Amino acid sequence: GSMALKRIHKELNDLARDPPAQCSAGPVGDDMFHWQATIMGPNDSPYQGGVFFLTIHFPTDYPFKPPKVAFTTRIYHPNINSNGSICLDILRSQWSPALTISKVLLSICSLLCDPNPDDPLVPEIARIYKTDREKYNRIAREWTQKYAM
Amino acid sequence: GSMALKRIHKELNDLARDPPAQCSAGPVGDDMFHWQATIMGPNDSPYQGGVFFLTIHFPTDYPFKPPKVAFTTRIYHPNINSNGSICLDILRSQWSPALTISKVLLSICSLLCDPNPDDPLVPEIARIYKTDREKYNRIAREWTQKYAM
Amino acid sequence: DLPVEEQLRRLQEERTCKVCMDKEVSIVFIPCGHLVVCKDCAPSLRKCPICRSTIKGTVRTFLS
Amino acid sequence: DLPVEEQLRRLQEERTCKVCMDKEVSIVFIPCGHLVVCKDCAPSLRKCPICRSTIKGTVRTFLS
Ligand SMILES: [Zn+2]
Ligand SMILES: [Zn+2]
Ligand SMILES: [Zn+2]
Ligand SMILES: [Zn+2]
């Protein structure tokens, strides 16, 4: 290569040794820059059970720019839009080359477990979430039923 | 301890794992600061065969001051006096805490293999050595015979 | 500390550059004081990748 | 590189302070640039123990 290349090869090669808890990812074709992750809906979120698939796309000048990550799977979460885009700090402003694809998946997981108050990507969902979890989680698990599993 | 203490303990503990080629040393009593080395006259010096014993004395503020080292064994060498003292750069001006007892023994060895022109501790011996090795080595091995083995 | 391998995989991993993650770390950041990247990765960075403290210089390390 | 142990004994030995040889190295010398002693041993030294270059300062390293 490289350099993103020789880097991403380690990334991948490490994600094999020590995969992040809930999921796995990898190259789709021989194009090492186009990845697909599968994330296994985390227990004690309202997404447990269902399985979710995400698309990873490394920029040519990764790790200095953050990778493009977005759910292909349908999902009910205030920080994920109807088109798949994720609303996460590291994915945008807070990204650092120091942090790995492995590490981002994790934070996505934890984001599914704990959505946000200031960030609402979909204001439709956020409001229901704010002080009516009861309702929120029903629709959350309902979608998990319908589209995830 | 320590600190010289905890240091010297490693010194010793390492000199066991990886002893310097020709010799070994260690504490005499429980006084870790009074050591005795035995150095095994190096092959292709005129001292081969014979065995030599040296006395090591660590200063209380070792490694910042160099250890006191001197042959108890008799020896014919321009850089060692009739009383046992060694004339070596590191033993005096060139000492550095970075370097170990192990490392000094080595340089003593190599000093026995290659004496000096500017340093003559015993000018009596140096002159014979200068341009009459023939003679020098005879007396050198002769002493090895008489006192070393 | 658990037997056979590691630290070793881990020990080297603590000592390798944090961005190329290939070359060994060599550069202390000024002023943040992190010894966390190799000589080569440095120029491409404005802020130290660890604390987002902005880099203003480098000291090179000689483990000689 | 030969099997079981080492580097490890050796790897740690490359990373440990050069004078107390107990505590891990933490300090880059100014100006000689050696990262070769731990915080504690430094004060007792005028010259860097490796190259007899005289010390004029220190930078502290944060491997965080
Ligand atoms: Zn690098
Ligand atoms: Zn920093
Ligand atoms: Zn130290
Ligand atoms: Zn130096």
For the record, the structure tokens of C11 come out as 């020990």
Tell which residue, C18, C13, C22, has the closest CA to residue A17: C13
Distance from CA of A98 to the nearest CA of C (A): 5
Q: What is the distance between the alpha carbons of residues C39 and A5, in angstroms, rounded to a whole number?
A: 19
Amino acid at C1: D
Which domains are assigned to chain A? 1-149 (3.10.110.10)
CB A88 within 8 A of CB A108: yes
Asked if omega into C3 is within 30° of 0 (cis), the reply is: no
Q: What's the number of domains chain D is made of?
A: 1
Q: Does B touch D (3+ CB pairs < 8 Å)? A: yes
B21 — phi, psi (to 5°)? 45, -75
Q: What is the distance between the alpha carbons of residues A131 and A127, in angstroms, rounded to a whole number?
A: 8
CB B104 within 8 A of CB B90: yes
D45 part of contact set with chain C, CB < 8 Å: no
Structure solved via: X-ray
Residues 6+ apart with CB under 8 A from D46: D54, D55
Structure resolution, Å: 3.4
Residue A26 φ/ψ region, left for φ over 0, alpha for ψ in the -120 to 50 degree band, beta for the rest:
left
As to burial, measured by CB atoms within 10 angstroms (0-12 exposed, 13-18 middle, 19+ buried), residue C20 is buried
Residue D18 and residue B64: Cβ atoms within 8 Å?
no
Q: What is the distance between the alpha carbons of residues C18 and A100, in angstroms, rounded to a whole number?
A: 10
Residue C20 and residue A98: Cβ atoms within 8 Å?
no
For the record, the structure tokens of B118 come out as 């500017």
Q: What is the distance between the alpha carbons of residues B78 and B120, in angstroms, rounded to a whole number?
A: 6
Q: What is the distance between the alpha carbons of residues B59 and A80, in angstroms, rounded to a whole number?
A: 70
C7 part of contact set with chain D, CB < 8 Å: yes
HEC per residue, chain D: CCCCCCCCHHHHHHHECCCCCCCECCEEEECCCEEEECCCCHHHCCECCCCCCECCEEEECECC
Residue B97's Cα: distance from chain center in Å? 17
Helix (H, G, I), strand (E, B) or coil at B35: strand
Q: For position C37, which CATH number holds? A: 3.30.40.10
Residue A97 and residue C22: Cβ atoms within 8 Å?
no
Tell which residue, A86, A61, A64, has the closest CA to residue A73: A86
Amino acid at A111: L
Could you list the residue range(s) of the whole structural domain that residue C52 is in? 1-64
D touches which chains (3+ CB pairs under 8 A)?
Answer: B, C
As to burial, measured by CB atoms within 10 angstroms (0-12 exposed, 13-18 middle, 19+ buried), residue A113 is middle
Q: Residue B32 has what DSSP assignment?
A: T
Q: What is the distance between the alpha carbons of residues B17 and D64, in angstroms, rounded to a whole number?
A: 33
Q: What is the distance between the alpha carbons of residues A14 and A18, in angstroms, rounded to a whole number?
A: 6
* CA D35 vs CA B72, D15, D58: distances in Å: 39, 9, 10
B touches which chains (3+ CB pairs under 8 A)?
Answer: D
CA triplet D26, D30, D32: central angle to 5 degrees?
A: 95
Search chain B and give the residue with CA nearest D43: B64
Q: What is the distance between the alpha carbons of residues A11 and B55, in angstroms, rounded to a whole number?
A: 56
Amino acid at C24: E
Distance from CA of A144 to the nearest CA of C (A): 36
Torsion of CA D11, D14, D16, D19, to 10 degrees: 150
Which residues of chain A lie closer than 8 angstroms to C19, CB-CB? 7, 63-64, 97-98
- Which of D6, D10, D17, D22 is the best substitution to test chain B (most B C-beta atoms within 10 A)? D22
CA triplet A22, A20, A62: central angle to 5 degrees?
A: 125
Residue B7 and residue D52: Cβ atoms within 8 Å?
no
Q: What is the distance between the alpha carbons of residues B30 and B28, in angstroms, rounded to a whole number?
A: 7
What is the residue-wise DSSP string for A57-96? E--TTTTTS--EEEESS---BTTB-TT-BB--TTTTTT--
Helix (H, G, I), strand (E, B) or coil at A13: helix
CB B15 within 8 A of CB B101: yes
Q: What is the distance between the alpha carbons of residues C14 and C24, in angstroms, rounded to a whole number?
A: 9
